[PDB]
Design an enzyme around this catalytic site. Structure first.
Site, PDB file in Angstrom:
ATOM      1  N   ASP A   1       0.806  -1.216   0.000  1.00 17.48           N
ATOM      2  CA  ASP A   1       0.000   0.000   0.000  1.00 17.48           C
ATOM      3  C   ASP A   1       0.852   1.285   0.000  1.00 17.48           C
ATOM      4  O   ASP A   1       1.279   1.756   1.047  1.00 17.48           O
ATOM      5  CB  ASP A   1      -0.914  -0.040   1.243  1.00 17.48           C
ATOM      6  N   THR A   2       1.158   1.763  -1.202  1.00 21.28           N
ATOM      7  CA  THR A   2       2.037   2.888  -1.314  1.00 21.28           C
ATOM      8  C   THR A   2       1.407   4.177  -0.756  1.00 21.28           C
ATOM      9  O   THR A   2       2.148   5.127  -0.447  1.00 21.28           O
ATOM     10  CB  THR A   2       2.501   3.122  -2.729  1.00 21.28           C
ATOM     11  N   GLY A   3       0.085   4.187  -0.551  1.00 20.70           N
ATOM     12  CA  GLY A   3      -0.587   5.321   0.053  1.00 20.70           C
ATOM     13  C   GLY A   3      -0.681   5.268   1.566  1.00 20.70           C
ATOM     14  O   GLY A   3      -1.239   6.205   2.175  1.00 20.70           O
TER      15      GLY A   3
HETATM   16  C1  LIG Z   1      -6.654   1.291   3.814  1.00 22.23           C
HETATM   17  C2  LIG Z   1      -6.581   0.811   2.366  1.00 22.23           C
HETATM   18  C3  LIG Z   1      -6.989  -0.664   2.171  1.00 22.23           C
HETATM   19  C4  LIG Z   1      -7.450   1.644   1.361  1.00 22.23           C
HETATM   20  N1  LIG Z   1      -7.160   3.098   1.324  1.00 22.23           N
HETATM   21  C5  LIG Z   1      -5.905   3.429   0.629  1.00 22.23           C
HETATM   22  C6  LIG Z   1      -4.757   3.736   1.582  1.00 22.23           C
HETATM   23  O1  LIG Z   1      -3.584   3.811   0.749  1.00 22.23           O
HETATM   24  C7  LIG Z   1      -4.922   5.041   2.385  1.00 22.23           C
HETATM   25  C8  LIG Z   1      -4.854   6.295   1.531  1.00 22.23           C
HETATM   26  C9  LIG Z   1      -4.982   7.527   2.404  1.00 22.23           C
HETATM   27  C10 LIG Z   1      -3.874   8.326   2.701  1.00 22.23           C
HETATM   28  C11 LIG Z   1      -4.001   9.382   3.591  1.00 22.23           C
HETATM   29  C12 LIG Z   1      -5.217   9.680   4.156  1.00 22.23           C
HETATM   30  C13 LIG Z   1      -6.325   8.948   3.876  1.00 22.23           C
HETATM   31  C14 LIG Z   1      -6.214   7.831   3.044  1.00 22.23           C
HETATM   32  N2  LIG Z   1      -3.879   5.058   3.382  1.00 22.23           N
HETATM   33  C15 LIG Z   1      -4.062   4.905   4.651  1.00 22.23           C
HETATM   34  O2  LIG Z   1      -5.146   4.689   5.199  1.00 22.23           O
HETATM   35  O3  LIG Z   1      -2.875   4.957   5.388  1.00 22.23           O
HETATM   36  C16 LIG Z   1      -2.952   4.980   6.804  1.00 22.23           C
HETATM   37  C17 LIG Z   1      -1.808   4.121   7.275  1.00 22.23           C
HETATM   38  O4  LIG Z   1      -0.648   4.932   7.141  1.00 22.23           O
HETATM   39  C18 LIG Z   1      -1.031   6.305   7.376  1.00 22.23           C
HETATM   40  O5  LIG Z   1      -0.525   7.100   6.321  1.00 22.23           O
HETATM   41  C19 LIG Z   1      -1.621   7.634   5.511  1.00 22.23           C
HETATM   42  C20 LIG Z   1      -2.883   7.518   6.367  1.00 22.23           C
HETATM   43  C21 LIG Z   1      -2.560   6.368   7.322  1.00 22.23           C
HETATM   44  S1  LIG Z   1      -8.413   4.121   1.322  1.00 22.23           S
HETATM   45  O6  LIG Z   1      -7.919   5.457   1.262  1.00 22.23           O
HETATM   46  O7  LIG Z   1      -9.227   3.843   2.485  1.00 22.23           O
HETATM   47  C22 LIG Z   1      -9.349   3.891  -0.099  1.00 22.23           C
HETATM   48  C23 LIG Z   1     -10.426   2.978  -0.120  1.00 22.23           C
HETATM   49  C24 LIG Z   1     -11.155   2.799  -1.355  1.00 22.23           C
HETATM   50  C25 LIG Z   1     -10.647   3.433  -2.523  1.00 22.23           C
HETATM   51  N3  LIG Z   1     -11.301   3.295  -3.703  1.00 22.23           N
HETATM   52  C26 LIG Z   1      -9.670   4.374  -2.433  1.00 22.23           C
HETATM   53  C27 LIG Z   1      -8.993   4.560  -1.254  1.00 22.23           C
END
Ligand SMILES: CC(C)CN(C[C@@H](O)[C@H](Cc1ccccc1)NC(=O)O[C@H]1CO[C@H]2OCC[C@H]21)S(=O)(=O)c1ccc(N)cc1
Lengths: 99, 99
Positions: free
Chosen positions: A25-27
């Protein structure tokens, strides 16, 4: 490996002798696993994602083998929808995005 | 190019007349952008992640340009904390994970 993205990038990890599936999960800044038991001290922490904030347990210096690649770092445990490997461990295994 | 993951993989996208910064997010099934009043029809959807669900508007066949690369597909618009380019568009621009 090279992993394309027409499907979710799910991979097997080994953590504490257990095999789990996790999403690369690069996000995600952080690695967040669903409820499980890990030994040792942890600290309460909070983290926010798309839907708001959750409480997690922060464990430091945990070994995980991700597709055969070794990492040792921070693992957050709590109510994530799915096990995610975030950039803190993706960097350790030399993972990049390429196009 | 190759993008390492020491920092968030933020890139420039264009949607229209709006240029925005968005994450290249292998953990996101679909692209989710922060609130914008795009033309045309849409359908309501709710998507879930860490912290729970948000309500979004699903717009289909939207052209976006990502680092000068062309894409066209579904874009979910809603109150996401962070813009994310999800797998639906990452594949179109040739993005893989490599380690
Ligand atoms: C949790 C994942 C299975 C899915 N998500 C993508 C994810 O990359 C999010 C993307 C993301 C990024 C920032 C803020 C909200 C969401 N990152 C995230 O929740 O990371 C958390 C863990 O590390 C921390 O760093 C970032 C937030 C914390 S998600 O944003 O909920 C999502 C769900 C459905 C879709 N279509 C698009 C995105």
């Amino acid at each position: 490996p090279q992993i394309t993205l027409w499907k979710r990038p799910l991979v097997t990890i080994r953590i504490g002798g257990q095999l789990k599936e996790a999403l690369l999960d690069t996000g995600a800044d952080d690695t967040v696993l669903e409820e499980m038991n890990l030994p040792g001290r942890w600290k309460p922490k909070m983290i926010g994602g798309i839907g708001g904030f959750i409480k997690v347990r922060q464990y430091d210096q945990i070994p995980i083998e991700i597709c055969g690649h070794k990492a040792i770092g921070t693992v957050l445990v709590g109510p994530t929808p799915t096990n995610v490997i975030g950039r803190n461990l993706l960097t350790q295994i030399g993972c990049t995005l390429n196009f």
